[PDB]
Write an enzyme that holds these catalytic residues in place. Structure first.
Site, mmCIF file in Angstrom:
data_model
loop_
_atom_site.group_PDB
_atom_site.id
_atom_site.type_symbol
_atom_site.label_atom_id
_atom_site.label_comp_id
_atom_site.label_asym_id
_atom_site.label_seq_id
_atom_site.Cartn_x
_atom_site.Cartn_y
_atom_site.Cartn_z
ATOM 1 C CE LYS B 143 -0.482 26.204 43.625
ATOM 2 N NZ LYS B 143 -1.372 26.830 44.640
ATOM 3 C CG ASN B 146 1.917 26.751 38.951
ATOM 4 O OD1 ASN B 146 1.634 25.572 38.732
ATOM 5 N ND2 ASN B 146 1.078 27.588 39.549
#
Lengths: 144, 376, 754
Positions: B143, B146
């Site tokens: 993601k 992240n």
């Protein structure tokens, strides 16, 4: 999808563009290659080209930018204009045909250290009809 | 799992840097050498609201995390776990203090990114994903939130909480992650139990979707309702807008299209993606030996490029205020300014979750009676 | 620290605070920043000015006249004369700690500006005045024209400071002699402080309950040498210090006691005394009736105490467990309480180290204070109905009615033996109100008793210090008030009462909201951005509307549910509203207009566009462009003027549309290079854009039902529904309308270029 020989020709071309190996086209070298063929763009024109081709204002051109700018599909009309301009560049003499001598002067202007035998073999292999001249159809089919 | 007094006399706490669902990030300094770090304080007790079973599962998950990060340590583009401390109530995980926030803030502030940084970012991501796949470790949580950013534009992956080892010959059948980032395989496995499972193809799909949202600026698949979103995720009809992808190269579009493929077998791998001409570069070489036909070709393309650069330069159009009165969205600077101003005015309504997303701001549909037809 | 006040951007008087006299500063980076700012902004040729735009000793201003008329356009710009006192402060500041080259540079600079008088001795002039003739040149070439001395120059202050600095630099005196208190070491960091916490049981049952779960404590007894009482007794005792009868001195006035005072031990007549913290007081407000509230205030107090602790010795906190801390059954402590105690154990709770034990061990290592001044030198039918009737609603109603009618202090005679006053019965009502935890009338009875929350004034001054303007009351004006300066406690309370009128509960709700805002500002001072003025009534209306939408009920039901909501639930709702987390876009536009969350640079863009036009008229009212030279973008008056101009329309959607159109106009003004020289009406822009959108939608083929009309604004609701950006957003239509209007008032030429 590209192939290995195409990439080899591309890197040879990029090395040919940059007379002094530095990793960048550079404004001065672009001006030099522009004047070599017989055009005089001004400094403002040149920086306009530089900022148009590049994605930012760094004023430099690298290898992937050339990949992007010459891998584009130009269709027919614009490609027709481009090939006509290339022909006219090769057709400095008002005859409409390409001879070995004309190729010789064009390579000398571009900065190629070749020989008469090499250019003779080049024109012989490139030609199909064997008349010593290249027609428009041969030029456009070769452009692949 | 050392005693807490060592942590108490070794690291000194400081002001907060971030907050989470149940953990907060706080800066700490190593007293002997005065180096800065970031710590992750995890309350396994959860303020006394957790049942003992939840507490035990939290401890087990944290331990399996710690032991899976231990093995991967060594890659410069991954988080370094400097120290760990365990108590009956808290876990203290010491990490490197990076500097800045995640890619979410950068994307929100800059709206859209260019290809120059994108090439480096995705080269690094492909290298990390290839290293992880070589180690037979899956992540399944790729993601933008992240990924952390440095002062020198350095990114390292984090949040391995969902990572788990995969024994050869095994096929996972678990569903997790935000609905926008599931590859079709997880959805099929959730719907029907007869499918064998999935694999690294979900990582490739996540790479492709983050490619699309980094380039276009909006996720390829998003809709206010979940079930339909699953439906046209299943059908797979991603489309490029007309006045949005008219100033991009064909190579990047081809790479993106190769990245997302419905068939798992036909999806590009990390090495195959790294072999794409988009990442091609040269340093020096003098072994180019070949036939005169290629010499004619190279001189012809040299002339063609030298004559095409000027024609590309001349193709520019002036401000054309009349066209501005007619339609201002055609011009790239006008669209960029409008998008930047719209993001600035309404930049406080974009956060995590499916309820609110970046795609909710742009409206490219011709809002009309055609909105009556939504679904069955 | 960066700004001297809310009206002066920078003042050179800040040097004295951050130099030789009265060292009171931390975070030396701030010291360097303010020194660099002063040097960059106020430095001149022969000295520096006190502050920008001061007209003292000027060839203008008509010196025989006071009370400066509001005509300071340019008559006092770049002509502030000089003041060498800030120059003579710099040499001392440099020579104090560790600087030498700065000292020589400043001494060399100062020797050039000196004037030699009788007997050939140094003399420091007060200021150098600009010549009355060469004034125009300075406006174009600042700090270039020579000046002449003006005014008195027997300046004892500057001369004495210079003499002291020279004597100190000569080496005869050391810096350690001028200050024997060692005030030059205020920049030394302090590592940390360990906090001690003691736990006690109120009775034997509580001790048994804690020992059930493994917590060992001692009851209130068994520690007979040590006694514990609340802190109000400590305040009353402290209210006797320094009292004299012959000289008519009443001693220290009564005031609340903070955690910093109750932490230390005390000695009163050879005895050990300990005082519990104030926030566990239930006879003042109901804030201490919630366990999670107690937990968070305890964590905040622990962090604050661990932060500074500029005293000697370890601190001590006593946290007894009361009967209200048990569960409904009264047989076990709540989950939050046991979690808090377990977190206190193991030496890590909140953001500080906590060590627990017994008061016996803490006695040998704790700060002790010795106090020496304490040493010896038919209403009867209504009453019957009240007695017979049941239900808290009826009891509260009849008590309120009797209190308003005849019983502010009259005895109801309900008990034939004991005289039961109305206040007496109302007070005993709290006992049974607290057990049911019915948050529907406790606020009502608190309004009757007119209970006032302590420490409101400090919260108000904290909120004011952040360059914000507060507001009390519901709209419209004159009923709306504006507290722009701190006010006394009694004055603030009466102002709140007048703004609240007879609704009563509004005052309690406003006090609660102010308390929440003050508490949340310190922890997260980033959520208040994009806001300039805080209005309580609009906030409460927003919460009521949001609750009504969430429950899909009537306004009365929403208000009743909001009143019933727990204080922690109220805090959560306030945080959710502040964070910002058909019917979707219209609601967002309505919320933004209600909270008027303007962008971070709206005023600067407004000033910039104003610089290139004659003004911006809205619905008749015009804002003249002459205001650009009378004010500055950083000045508050300009901002409040633009806000007053904007809020003429009552519809929040219209306000948001106005803001968007103004922003798009400011953006478009950059491309063109010309002067409009005309009044721009933005309502015409909005109407033209709406008409263009309507025509485009009709051309597309949408039916009439989709393209509806608003009842009292004339704008399609689908336009409100439209997203800002995109190819079909309102931004494109607004830009097109603005371009059309600009072309309508342009000399047949645009000449746009960027």
């Amino acid at each position: 999808q590209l192939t290995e020989e195409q990439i080899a020709e591309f890197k040879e071309a990029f090395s040919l563009f940059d007379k002094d190996g530095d990793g960048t086209i550079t404004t001065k070298e672009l001006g030099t290659v522009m004047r070599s063929l017989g055009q005089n763009p001004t400094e403002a024109e040149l920086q306009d080209m530089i900022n148009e081709v590049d994605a930012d204002g760094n004023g430099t051109i690298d290898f992937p930018e050339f990949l992007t700018m010459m891998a584009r599909k130009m269709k027919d009309t614009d490609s027709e204009e481009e090939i006509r301009e290339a022909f006219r560049v090769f057709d400095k003499d008002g005859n409409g045909y390409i001879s070995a001598a004309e190729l010789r002067h064009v390579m000398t202007n571009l900065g190629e250290k070749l020989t008469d035998e090499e250019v003779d073999e080049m024109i012989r292999e490139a030609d199909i009809d064997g008349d010593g001249q290249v027609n428009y159809e041969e030029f456009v089919q070769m452009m692949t | 799992s050392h005693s807490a007094q060592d942590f108490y006399e070794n690291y000194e706490p400081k002001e907060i840097l971030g907050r989470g669902v149940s953990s907060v990030v706080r800066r700490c300094i190593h007293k002997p050498t005065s180096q800065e770090y970031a710590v992750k304080v995890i309350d396994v007790t959860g303020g006394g609201s957790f049942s003992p079973e939840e507490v035990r599962e939290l401890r087990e998950a944290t331990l399996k995390e710690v032991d899976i990060l231990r093995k991967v340590s060594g890659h410069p583009n991954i988080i370094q776990l400097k120290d760990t401390y365990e108590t009956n109530t808290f876990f203290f995980l010491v990490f490197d203090l990076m500097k800045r926030g995640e890619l979410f803030d950068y994307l929100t502030e800059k709206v859209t990114l260019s290809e120059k940084e994108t090439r480096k970012i995705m080269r690094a991501l492909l290298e990390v994903i290839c290293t992880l796949h070589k180690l037979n470790i899956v992540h399944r949580d790729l993601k933008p939130e992240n990924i952390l950013l440095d002062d020198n534009m350095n990114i390292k992956l984090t949040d391995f909480g969902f990572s788990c080892q995969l024994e050869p010959g095994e096929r996972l059948r678990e569903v997790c992650g935000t609905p926008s980032y599931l590859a079709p395989e997880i959805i099929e496995c959730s719907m029907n139990e007869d499918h064998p499972g999935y694999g690294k193809e979900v990582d490739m799909w996540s790479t492709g979707v983050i490619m699309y949202t980094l380039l276009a600026g909006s996720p390829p698949f998003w809709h206010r309702k979940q079930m339909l979103m699953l439906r046209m995720i299943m059908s797979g009809n991603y489309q490029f807008g007309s006045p949005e992808w008219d100033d991009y190269s064909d190579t990047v579009k081809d790479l993106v299209s190769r990245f997302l493929v419905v068939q798992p077998q036909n999806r590009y791998t990390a090495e195959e993606a790294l072999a794409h001409p988009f990442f091609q570069q040269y340093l020096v070489e003098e072994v180019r030996h070949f036939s005169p036909r290629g010499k004619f070709k190279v001189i012809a393309l040299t002339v063609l490029a030298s004559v095409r650069i000027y024609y590309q330069y001349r193709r520019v159009k002036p401000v054309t205020r009349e066209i501005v009165i007619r339609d201002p969205y055609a011009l790239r600077p006008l669209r960029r300014l409008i998008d930047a101003y719209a993001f600035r005015i309404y930049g406080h309504w974009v956060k995590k979750g499916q309820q609110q997303n970046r795609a909710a701001l742009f409206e490219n549909t011709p809002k009309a009676v055609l909105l009556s037809l939504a679904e069955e | 620290l960066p700004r001297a006040s809310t009206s002066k951007e920078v003042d050179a008087s800040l040097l004295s605070v951050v130099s030789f006299p009265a060292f009171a500063v931390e975070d030396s980076q701030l010291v360097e920043l303010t020194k660099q700012e002063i040097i960059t902004k106020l430095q001149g040729r022969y000295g520096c000015c006190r502050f920008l735009r001061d007209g003292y000793k000027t060839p203008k201003e008509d010196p025989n006249r006071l009370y400066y008329e509001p005509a300071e356009l340019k008559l006092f710009e770049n002509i502030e004369c000089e003041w060498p006192l800030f120059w003579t402060y710099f040499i001392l500041d440099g020579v104090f700690s560790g600087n030498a080259e700065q000292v020589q540079e400043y001494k060399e600079a100062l020797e050039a500006v000196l004037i030699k008088g009788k007997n050939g001795v140094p003399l420091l002039p007060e200021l150098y005045s600009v010549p009355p003739d060469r004034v125009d040149e300075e406006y174009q070439n600042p700090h270039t024209v020579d000046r002449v001395p003006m005014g008195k120059l027997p300046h004892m202050w500057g001369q004495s400071l210079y003499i002291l600095g020279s004597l100190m630099a000569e080496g005869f005196l050391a810096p350690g002699e001028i200050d024997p208190l060692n005030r030059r070491f205020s920049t030394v960091p302090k590592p940390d402080v360990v906090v001690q916490v003691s736990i006690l049981a109120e009775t034997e049952e509580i001790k048994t309950i804690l020992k059930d779960k493994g917590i060992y404590v001692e009851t209130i007894a068994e520690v007979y040498p040590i006694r514990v009482q609340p802190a109000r007794i400590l305040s009353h005792i402290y209210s006797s210090l320094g009292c004299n009868n012959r000289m008519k001195l009443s001693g220290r006035p009564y005031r609340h006691m903070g955690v910093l005072g109750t932490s230390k031990l005390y000695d009163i007549r050879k005895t050990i005394f300990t005082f519990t913290p104030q926030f566990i007081d239930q006879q003042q407000f109901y804030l201490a009736l919630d366990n999670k509230m107690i937990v968070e205030m305890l964590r905040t107090d622990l962090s604050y105490l661990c932060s500074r602790w500029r005293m000697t010795g370890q601190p001590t906190i006593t946290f007894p467990i009361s009967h209200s801390m048990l569960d409904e059954d009264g047989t076990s402590l709540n989950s939050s309480i046991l979690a808090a105690l377990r977190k206190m154990q193991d030496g890590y709770f909140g953001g500080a180290r906590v060590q627990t034990g017994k008061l016996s061990e803490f006695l040998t290592t704790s700060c002790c204070t010795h106090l020496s001044f304490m040493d010896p030198g038919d209403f009867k039918a209504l009453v019957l109905q009240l007695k017979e009737t049941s239900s808290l609603q009826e009891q509260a109603d009849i008590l309120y009615m009797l209190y308003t009618m005849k019983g502010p202090d009259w005895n109801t005679e309900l008990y034939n033996e004991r005289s039961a006053t109305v206040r007496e019965l109302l007070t005993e009502l709290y006992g049974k109100v607290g057990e049911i935890r019915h948050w529907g009338l406790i606020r009502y009875i608190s309004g009757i008793l007119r209970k006032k929350v302590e420490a409101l004034d400090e919260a108000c001054t904290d909120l004011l210090s952040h360059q914000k303007h507060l507001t009390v009351g519901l709209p419209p004006e004159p009923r709306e008030k504006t507290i722009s300066a701190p006010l006394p406690y009694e004055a603030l309370t009466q102002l709140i009462d007048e703004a609240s009128e007879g609704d009563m509960s509004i005052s309690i709700l406003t006090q609660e909201i102010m308390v929440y805002l003050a508490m949340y500002m310190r922890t997260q001072p980033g959520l208040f951005a994009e806001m300039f003025r805080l209005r309580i009534g609009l906030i409460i209306q927003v919460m009521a509307t949001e609750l009504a939408h969430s429950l899909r009920c009537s306004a009365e039901e929403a208000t009743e549910g909001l009143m019933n909501l727990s204080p922690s639930a109220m805090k959560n709702l306030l945080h959710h509203i502040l964070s910002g987390k058909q019917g979707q876009w219209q609601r967002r536009r309505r919320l933004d207009g209600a909270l008027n969350r303007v962008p971070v640079g709206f005023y600067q863009k407004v000033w910039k566009v104003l610089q290139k036009c004659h003004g911006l008229s809205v619905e008749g009212f015009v804002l003249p462009s002459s205001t650009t030279r009378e004010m500055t973008p950083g000045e508050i008056k300009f901002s409040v003027h633009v806000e007053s101009v904007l809020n003429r329309v009552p519809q929040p959607e219209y306000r948001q549309l106005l803001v968007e159109a103004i922003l798009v106009l400011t953006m478009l003004a950059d491309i063109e290079i010309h002067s409009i020289g005309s009044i721009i009406a933005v309502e015409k822009i909005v109407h033209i854009a709406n008409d263009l959108f309507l025509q485009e939608q009709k051309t597309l083929g949408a039916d009439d039902t989709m393209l509806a009309k608003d009842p009292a604004s004339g704008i399609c609701t689908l336009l409100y529904d439209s997203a800002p950006s995109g190819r079909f957003g309102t931004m494109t239509y607004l830009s097109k309308a603005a371009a059309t209007y600009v072309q309508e008032f342009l000399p047949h030429s645009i000449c746009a270029m960027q």
